[PDB]
Amino acid sequence: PPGPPGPPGQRGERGFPGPPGPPGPPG
Amino acid sequence: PPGPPGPPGQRGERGFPGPPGPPGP
Amino acid sequence: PPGPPGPPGQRGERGFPGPPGPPGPPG
């Protein structure tokens, strides 16, 4: 018979960091 | 015969927050 | 006997990009 199904793939790499935050409050 | 390929891996974890924004005008 | 185990799954896709950072410092 056909062999067992292969093991599940590894979890992908972590996503990239997000964009810079909103500009600070005007003094 | 060999088994079929395993399922694709889960999507990676979401990235970390970005850096603090630029200083006030 | 049953065949050899299947190939491993492909590694997952990269995660989604992160959220925006905190708001900037004041003036």
Write out chain B in H/E/C secondary structure.
CCCCCCCCCCCCCCCCCCCCCCCCC
- Residues in chain B within 8 Å Cβ distance of A20: 18-22
Q: What resolution in angstroms does the PDB record give?
A: 1.5
**Residue A17 and residue C15: Cα distance in Å, rounded?**
10
**Residue C1 and residue B13: Cα distance in Å, rounded?**
40
Select from A8, A14, A19 the Cβ nearest to the Cβ of B9.
A8
**Residue C14 and residue B13: Cα distance in Å, rounded?**
8
Candidates A23, C7, C16; CA nearest to B25 is A23
B neighbours by CB contacts (3+ pairs under 8 Å): A, C
**Residue A8 and residue B5: Cα distance in Å, rounded?**
8
